[PDB]
């Protein structure tokens, strides 16, 4: 979408699109890792839909559940760091550059308009008071 767009501005010795282009190997590695883990999870859930190693001896079978919950939590906490370091923050940086550019353009325009309006208001008030003084002058000139 930034093909010859008015929003494709210069930031950090480059334009906006070059950062997005450089984001490619990060996304590649992240996708490969996520795909491998998803394949492993798919195989695990498919091969043990109805198996002994899932409905164990006692009805309780709580120790295995808690061990699995521990392993799952360890994996999730490791994945938070992995995903945050590989692709989330490189993308967030570019998106913040985008948002900052739009915001600075917007409030620059707003500040320009506000300054113009404030100057016009001051000038019109001063001139209108000047004509009020003019009325005073003509009145007390006419009385005498």
């Amino acid at each position: 979408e930034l093909y010859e767009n008015v929003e494709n501005v210069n930031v950090e010795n480059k334009t906006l699109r070059q950062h997005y282009s450089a984001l490619i190997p990060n996304l590649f590695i992240a996708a490969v890792a996520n795909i491998s883990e998803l394949n492993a999870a798919d195989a695990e859930a498919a091969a043990y839909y109805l198996h002994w190693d899932t409905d164990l001896a006692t009805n309780d079978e709580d120790e295995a559940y808690y061990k699995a919950k521990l392993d799952f939590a360890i994996e999730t906490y490791a994945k938070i760091l992995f995903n945050g370091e590989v692709w989330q923050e490189p993308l967030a940086y570019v998106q913040n550059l985008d948002a900052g550019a739009r915001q600075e353009a917007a409030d620059r325009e707003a500040a320009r308009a506000a300054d113009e309006a404030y100057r016009a208001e001051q000038l019109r008030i001063a001139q209108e008071a000047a004509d009020a003084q003019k009325a005073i002058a003509e009145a007390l000139a006419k009385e005498a």
Partner: protein
């Protein structure tokens, strides 16, 4: 417009699975869960 999908917006959002979710006990069968997971697995198969 801009691309705010992965920044600023509600730090904890339900749209991505980052918000918290209170759970009571409700029985959804193994078949129901397998159907729900295969529904998205169909979409992800081409990538996979």
């Amino acid at each position: 417009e801009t691309n705010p999908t992965f920044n600023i917006t509600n730090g904890f959002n339900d749209a991505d699975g980052s918000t918290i979710q209170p759970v009571g006990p409700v029985n959804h069968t193994e078949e129901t869960l397998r159907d729900l997971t295969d529904s998205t697995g169909a979409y992800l198969e081409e990538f996979q």
